Design a protein around this motif. Structure first.
Motif, PDB file in Angstrom:
ATOM      1  N   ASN A 174      -7.719   2.785  12.556  1.00 41.56           N
ATOM      2  CA  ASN A 174      -6.698   2.486  11.569  1.00 41.56           C
ATOM      3  C   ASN A 174      -7.050   1.176  10.877  1.00 41.56           C
ATOM      4  O   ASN A 174      -7.766   0.337  11.428  1.00 41.56           O
ATOM      5  CB  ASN A 174      -5.317   2.392  12.217  1.00 41.56           C
ATOM      6  N   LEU A 175      -6.539   1.006   9.662  1.00 45.70           N
ATOM      7  CA  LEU A 175      -6.874  -0.157   8.849  1.00 45.70           C
ATOM      8  C   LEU A 175      -6.145  -1.421   9.286  1.00 45.70           C
ATOM      9  O   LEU A 175      -6.165  -2.414   8.551  1.00 45.70           O
ATOM     10  CB  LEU A 175      -6.577   0.135   7.377  1.00 45.70           C
ATOM     11  N   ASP A 219      -3.640  10.421  -4.240  1.00 47.82           N
ATOM     12  CA  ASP A 219      -4.734   9.928  -3.411  1.00 47.82           C
ATOM     13  C   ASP A 219      -4.363   8.685  -2.616  1.00 47.82           C
ATOM     14  O   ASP A 219      -4.519   8.663  -1.393  1.00 47.82           O
ATOM     15  CB  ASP A 219      -5.963   9.633  -4.285  1.00 47.82           C
ATOM     16  N   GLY A 220      -3.879   7.642  -3.286  1.00 47.30           N
ATOM     17  CA  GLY A 220      -3.550   6.400  -2.617  1.00 47.30           C
ATOM     18  C   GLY A 220      -3.830   5.190  -3.480  1.00 47.30           C
ATOM     19  O   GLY A 220      -4.858   5.133  -4.162  1.00 47.30           O
ATOM     20  N   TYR A 221      -2.927   4.213  -3.462  1.00 48.29           N
ATOM     21  CA  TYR A 221      -3.079   3.040  -4.307  1.00 48.29           C
ATOM     22  C   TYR A 221      -2.423   1.840  -3.643  1.00 48.29           C
ATOM     23  O   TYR A 221      -1.558   1.977  -2.774  1.00 48.29           O
ATOM     24  CB  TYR A 221      -2.488   3.271  -5.703  1.00 48.29           C
ATOM     25  N   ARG A 222      -2.851   0.655  -4.068  1.00 47.93           N
ATOM     26  CA  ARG A 222      -2.339  -0.608  -3.564  1.00 47.93           C
ATOM     27  C   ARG A 222      -1.729  -1.406  -4.705  1.00 47.93           C
ATOM     28  O   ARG A 222      -2.194  -1.331  -5.846  1.00 47.93           O
ATOM     29  CB  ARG A 222      -3.444  -1.435  -2.902  1.00 47.93           C
ATOM     30  N   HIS A 226      -4.476   6.528   1.095  1.00 50.69           N
ATOM     31  CA  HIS A 226      -5.308   5.339   1.154  1.00 50.69           C
ATOM     32  C   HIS A 226      -4.471   4.124   1.549  1.00 50.69           C
ATOM     33  O   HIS A 226      -3.253   4.084   1.357  1.00 50.69           O
ATOM     34  CB  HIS A 226      -6.002   5.097  -0.187  1.00 50.69           C
ATOM     35  N   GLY A 227      -5.144   3.127   2.116  1.00 52.67           N
ATOM     36  CA  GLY A 227      -4.477   1.941   2.601  1.00 52.67           C
ATOM     37  C   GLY A 227      -3.858   2.067   3.976  1.00 52.67           C
ATOM     38  O   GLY A 227      -3.245   1.103   4.450  1.00 52.67           O
ATOM     39  N   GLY A 228      -4.000   3.215   4.630  1.00 50.09           N
ATOM     40  CA  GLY A 228      -3.448   3.404   5.961  1.00 50.09           C
ATOM     41  C   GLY A 228      -1.936   3.375   6.028  1.00 50.09           C
ATOM     42  O   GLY A 228      -1.374   2.781   6.957  1.00 50.09           O
ATOM     43  N   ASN A 232       0.826  -1.196   0.000  1.00 45.60           N
ATOM     44  CA  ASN A 232       0.000   0.000   0.000  1.00 45.60           C
ATOM     45  C   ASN A 232       0.867   1.255   0.000  1.00 45.60           C
ATOM     46  O   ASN A 232       2.044   1.227   0.369  1.00 45.60           O
ATOM     47  CB  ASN A 232      -0.937   0.003   1.208  1.00 45.60           C
ATOM     48  N   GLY A 254     -10.120   0.286   1.399  1.00 49.10           N
ATOM     49  CA  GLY A 254     -10.345  -0.238   2.724  1.00 49.10           C
ATOM     50  C   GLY A 254      -9.091  -0.840   3.322  1.00 49.10           C
ATOM     51  O   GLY A 254      -7.969  -0.569   2.883  1.00 49.10           O
TER      52      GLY A 254
END
Ligand SMILES: *P(=O)(O)OC[C@H]1O[C@@H](n2cnc3c(N)ncnc32)[C@H](O)[C@@H]1O
Ligand SMILES: *P(=O)(O)OC[C@H]1O[C@@H](n2cnc3c(N)ncnc32)[C@H](O)[C@@H]1O
Lengths: 457, 112, 111, 457
Positions: free
Chosen positions: D391-392, C76-79, B88-90, B84, C106
Motif C-alpha cells: 500500500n502507498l 482512473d485516479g487523481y490527486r 490511484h493514490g491508494g 487523493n 505513486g
C-alpha cells in the motif's frame, strides 16, 4: 611571416620540398608537394593551378588556384626530406576570390562578416579535442556481412589475452603512469605541436579505456584555431603512426565506454575588451546571453556541421556523459552550453559541448559564430538558466538525434548561415548531399545487433 | 455506506478540532512528523461526488487546515495538502480525507 | 506583491475553465493530465486565507471535479495537491491546487 | 510392497544385481551393489553391515559399523545399468538396537514425521518441491597455487553466437522459446518418461529463464519422506539422462553470473483425517494454523537457511535484485516475498509456498527443518504479522546473506529442531563442521574477480 620570410626560411633550413595543404568539405586535409626551387615571388602572387574534380563535393571545368598563405609556413617534422608546410586557400581562376565551397574561405568570410557587423573585432575559439589510441583496427563489409575489431594493450578486455596493469572501463581518467601507458606518446605529441606553432597547456588520459587521450591547446582566433586543429590532427595521427599505434578522432569507436568530444569555448572581443563579461548570470553580459540564445535556436542546424558523422549521434545519447539538453548553466552537467568559472573577467567565455572531433573545424566554427551573431542581431533571449531545482525534478529542446534530422534542419534553416554571404546555397546543398550519401550507406547496411535481436523472430 | 470516519464524526470512538462541517484528527500511522487528517462532517464517498450543496464545507476544510497549521506552528516551515481519490493514490477509505503533511522537508510531487 | 497568475487573471499575458472566482490552466506537464486551479482573488499563501474569500475554495474542488469529468480521468485516479511555503516548495507564491492524473500515481511522498 | 513382492519382482525381471542406496549428510546419494542371489528373507530382517567411516560426517572415535536396512516399498528397476539392477532405498541403523542413525537424513525425516503425528496437529505433511537444473555441454574448473578457473560451454549459450563449430536463447530470455531455439525438448521428454518409469509423477516440463540450457521438470507432491526419495530419484534421473545424451547436468544454485539461478520452491500442506488444515477464512483463504506455520518459518528462517541453502553458491542467487525472493514476509501477490500463497480452485489444495531453498539442499534435512519450524510456530502461536501487500502508506527481516551467518544461526537457534529427538546435538555439530570446511575453502581462496579490482592498487 611574409613571402620574403618564407623565401629566407627555405635557404635557412635547406628546404627541399614545399607542401601545399588545404581542407575539403569533409574536413580531411589534402596536400600537394612541389620542389623548393619551384617556389618564387610570383608563386605567392599567382598560386598553383589544380583540379578539384576528384575532391568530394567540389564537382563543367574545375580548374582552381592554390593560393599559399605565407603566415602558415611550418617545417614538417615527419617527412624524411626537409619539407615546409604552407596552408593554402582555394580561389577561383578568373576573379581570384575565395571559392564558395572552401571551408577556410568560409571561415574568413565569417570573420569578415563579424568585423563588418560592428559587434566585435575578433572571435576566440578554444576547442578541446579527444582521440583514441589503438594498436590494431580491422573493419570490413560485404554481402556476407560486416565486422569491426578494436585491439590494444590498454583495452580492459585484454586481461587474459596472450602476449597486467590496464585501465578499466570508464576508469581511465588520471591513472598511474604504469597503467597509463600513453605518457611518452603524449609528451612527443606536445613537443611536436610546440615545434609546429601550437601552444600546449596540458595532456592527460581520458575516461574511456583502450587508450583515450586528450592534449589541450591554447585558444586563438577562429581561422588560426581551425588551422591549429588541423595541425593537431595531423601530428596526432603521425606521432601515433611512428610509435606503432593508430589514432582515430571518431566520436564513439566502441559502445559501453566514453566517447570522444570537442568542447568549444567561444568569446568575443572588441578593442581588447571581452564582450562576454558583465553583470548578468554567471558573470556574463547581454551579448553573451544573446549568443547563447542564438546558438540554442539554431543548434539542430549546427549539428549538421558540428556533428557530421553518424557516430556523433551514437555519442549524443541521453546519459553516458554526453549533454543533449539545449540549456545553459554553470553547474548543471546535463546542459549542452556551460559557462566555465574563471578568475578574471577577461577570460569569461561560453562552452558548447555537443560538437565532436570529427567535425570540420572551419565549418563548425563558422556555424557557431554565425548562430551567435544571429542571436545578437535578433536579440534572442536564451530563457532562464537550467540551474534551479523545481520540485526535485520535458519541453526543453534537444540536440538533433540523428544525422538525417540535422541535415533536414540545416536544409530548412539556412538564413543564419547565408547572412553576409558566408555560406552560399550551393555549398550547403553540396555538403548536405555529401553527408546524405554516408547516411544512406549507414542506414542501408544491416547491423550485427540486428542479427542478435531479430534472427530467430 | 458509512466508514470508520463516520464513527469518528459520531464521536463514538484523537480529535484535533471540531466544527459543524469539518473535523481534524491525528493519523494512526503518521507518514510525516506532523500528519493531521481533515474530513467533512457530512459523509461523501469521493470528491467526484461533491455537489454544490456541501461545497461550503470544502472551503471550511482549507480554513481548518490553515488554523491547525498555525496552531502547530508548522505554517512558517511549510506544509503540503494532499487529497487523493479513486484507484490511484491508494484510496482505501472512500471518504473525503485531506492530508496535512509538514515538519520534515517533504519530497517531490508524485514519485519520480 | 503580485505574481504571474495576477497578470494571467488580467489576461495581460492556456486557460481551461474560467469562473467568477476560479480559473483553470493547462504549464509543464508532470502528469498526462496536469491542470492547475487558482483563485481569482490573489492569496499569497494558503495560511493567509481570509473568511471573506473562503467560499471560492470549495468552487476550486467543484471545478476540479468538473474538469476530471471533462478530462475522462475520473475513472482512473487523481490527486489534489497544494504545496505551501518552503517545505512544500511554493514557487508561484500564490494558491495553486494541482489536479494530476492519467497514470497510476505513486505514494503521497517519495520516502 | 513387502519382501515377498521384492522377491517376486526379482524373479520376474530376471534381476541380477541389487543396488542399496542411501543419502549422506551432504545430500549425495551413496550406493552399494550386491548380487541378486544374496537377497533373501533374512536380508530384509537383518540388513547388510557396512563401514560408514569413509562417509563425510559419519566418522566416530569408536569406528563402529552400521547396518543398511532395505525398505521394500522403494524397489524400482534401474533404467540405466546394462545389467538388470533393482534399486532399493535403505535406512542406516545402529547395530543391535536396530534404531535410526542420528546422522542419517532419512531417519531424521522419519523422526520428523513421527513427531508431527505424535503432536496431534496433523497426520500427513505434503511437499511440492520444484527443482531446476542446468544442462551444459562441457564444464571445466580447477584450482591451484598458480590460480583458479571455471569455464562453462553449451550450444544454447548466448555467448556462442560467434563460436565456430544459429538459434539460441538470449540472456534471461530462455523462458518458453520456440522449439527450434531450445535444444532440450527431447532430453526433457526422455527425462519425464524415465521418471514416470521410476515411480515419479510428472506434471510438466519446460525451458527456464536462464540461457545455457536451464530446464525444469515438474513433479507431483507427496508425503515428506517419499517426496525426498522422489527428489533423489529426480536428481539421479536428470544426471544419468544428461550423461547418456552427451550433456552435463548440474543442480548448482548460481553456476553463472548475470543469468537466472536455480531454485527449489517448496509447497507445504498439513492434512488431518483427509481435510486440509491450511484452508480457512483468513488471508488468501488460509487458516490460523497456516499463519502460525508461516510465522514459525519466518522466525527461524536463518536457521533453516543452513539446511535449505547449504552452499556458498546458494547465496549468490539470494542477493537482492534478482528473481529469488529475499524478504522474510508472506503475500499472495508480491513477488519480493519469500513465502507465497498460490491461488487454487479448491480449498483441498491450499498450500504455503516457500521460495528461498535451493536444489543443492539435502531434501530430508531441508524438509525436516521446514516442518519443525512450522510445528514450533504452531505450538508457540507465532503470528507472522501482516501480508506484504504494498500500500502507498518494524523493519522486515531477511534471510541469511552468507553461509557463515546461517551456520551461526543454526548453532544458536537449534532448539526448534531438537524437539522430539528429530535432531540430536551431534548431528547439528557434524553438519556445521562439514559446511564450515567448505565455507573456509571458499573464503580462503583468491577470487578471479579480486584481480580485476585489486591488482593495480
Ligand atoms: P488514503 O487517503 O485512502 O488513506 C487515508 C489514511 O488515513 C489513515 N487512517 C485510517 N483510519 C484512521 C483512523 N481511524 N484514525 C486516523 N487515521 C486513520 C491511514 O493512514 C489511511 O491510509
Ligand atoms: P508550485 O506548487 O507553486 O507549482 C508551480 C506551478 O506553476 C506553474 N506555472 C508557472 N508559471 C506558469 C505559467 N506562466 N502558466 C501556467 N502555469 C505556470 C507550473 O506549471 C508549476 O506546476
Amino acid at each position: 611571416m611574409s613571402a620574403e620570410h618564407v623565401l629566407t626560411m627555405l635557404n635557412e633550413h635547406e628546404v627541399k620540398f614545399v607542401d601545399l595543404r588545404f581542407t575539403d568539405t569533409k574536413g580531411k586535409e589534402q596536400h600537394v608537394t612541389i620542389p623548393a626551387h619551384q617556389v618564387n615571388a610570383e608563386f605567392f602572387e599567382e598560386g598553383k593551378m589544380f583540379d578539384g574534380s576528384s575532391i568530394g563535393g567540389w564537382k563543367n571545368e574545375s580548374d582552381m588556384v592554390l593560393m599559399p598563405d605565407a603566415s602558415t609556413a611550418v617545417i614538417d617534422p615527419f617527412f624524411a626530406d626537409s619539407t615546409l608546410i604552407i596552408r593554402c586557400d582555394i580561389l577561383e581562376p578568373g576573379t581570384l576570390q575565395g571559392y564558395d565551397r572552401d571551408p577556410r574561405s568560409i571561415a574568413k568570410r565569417a570573420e569578415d562578416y563579424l568585423r563588418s557587423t560592428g559587434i566585435a573585432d575578433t572571435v576566440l575559439f578554444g576547442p578541446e579535442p579527444e582521440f583514441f589510441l589503438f594498436d590494431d583496427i580491422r573493419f570490413g563489409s560485404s554481402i556476407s556481412g560486416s565486422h569491426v575489431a578494436i585491439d590494444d594493450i590498454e583495452g580492459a578486455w585484454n586481461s587474459s589475452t596472450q602476449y597486467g596493469h590496464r585501465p578499466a572501463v570508464k576508469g581511465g581518467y588520471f591513472p598511474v603512469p604504469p597503467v597509463d601507458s600513453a605518457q611518452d606518446i603524449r609528451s612527443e605529441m606536445c613537443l611536436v605541436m610546440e615545434q609546429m606553432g601550437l601552444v600546449v597547456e596540458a595532456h592527460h588520459h581520458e575516461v574511456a579505456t583502450a587508450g583515450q587521450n586528450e592534449v589541450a591547446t591554447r585558444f586563438n582566433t577562429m581561422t588560426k584555431k581551425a588551422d591549429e586543429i588541423q595541425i593537431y590532427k595531423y601530428v596526432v595521427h603521425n606521432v601515433a603512426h611512428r610509435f606503432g599505434k593508430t589514432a582515430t578522432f571518431m566520436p564513439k569507436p566502441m559502445f559501453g565506454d566514453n566517447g570522444s568530444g570537442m568542447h568549444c569555448h567561444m568569446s568575443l572581443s572588441k578593442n581588447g575588451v571581452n564582450l562576454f563579461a558583465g553583470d548578468k548570470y554567471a558573470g556574463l553580459s547581454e551579448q553573451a546571453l544573446y549568443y547563447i540564445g542564438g546558438v540554442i535556436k539554431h543548434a539542430k542546424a549546427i549539428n549538421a556541421l558540428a556533428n557530421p558523422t553518424t557516430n556523433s549521434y551514437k555519442r549524443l545519447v541521453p546519459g553516458y556523459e554526453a549533454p543533449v539538453m539545449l540549456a545553459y548553466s554553470a553547474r548543471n552537467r546535463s546542459a549542452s552550453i556551460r559557462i566555465p568559472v574563471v578568475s578574471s573577467p577577461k577570460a569569461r567565455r561560453i562552452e558548447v559541448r555537443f560538437p565532436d572531433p570529427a567535425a570540420n573545424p572551419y565549418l563548425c566554427f563558422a556555424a557557431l559564430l554565425m548562430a551567435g551573431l544571429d542571436g545578437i542581431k535578433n536579440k534572442i533571449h536564451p530563457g532562464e538558466a537550467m540551474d534551479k531545482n523545481l520540485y526535485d525534478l520535458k519541453e526543453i529542446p534537444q540536440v538533433a538525434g540523428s544525422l538525417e534530422e540535422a541535415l533536414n534542419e540545416l536544409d530548412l534553416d539556412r538564413e543564419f548561415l547565408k547572412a553576409g554571404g558566408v555560406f552560399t546555397d550551393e555549398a550547403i546543398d553540396a555538403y548536405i548531399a555529401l553527408r546524405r550519401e554516408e547516411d544512406d550507406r549507414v542506414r542501408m547496411t544491416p547491423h550485427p545487433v540486428e542479427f542478435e535481436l531479430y534472427y530467430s523472430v | 455506506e458509512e466508514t470508520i470516519f463516520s464513527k469518528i464524526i459520531r464521536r463514538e470512538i484523537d480529535i484535533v478540532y471540531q466544527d459543524d462541517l469539518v473535523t481534524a484528527f491525528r493519523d494512526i500511522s503518521p507518514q510525516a512528523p506532523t500528519h493531521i487528517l481533515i474530513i467533512p462532517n457530512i459523509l461523501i464517498p469521493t470528491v467526484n461526488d461533491v455537489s454544490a450543496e456541501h461545497e461550503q464545507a470544502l472551503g471550511r476544510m482549507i480554513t481548518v487546515a490553515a488554523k491547525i497549521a498555525e496552531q502547530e506552528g508548522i505554517a512558517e516551515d511549510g506544509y503540503r495538502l494532499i487529497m487523493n481519490t479513486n484507484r490511484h493514490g491508494g484510496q482505501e477509505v472512500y471518504h473525503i480525507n485531506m492530508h496535512l503533511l509538514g515538519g520534515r522537508p517533504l519530497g517531490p510531487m508524485l514519485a519520480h
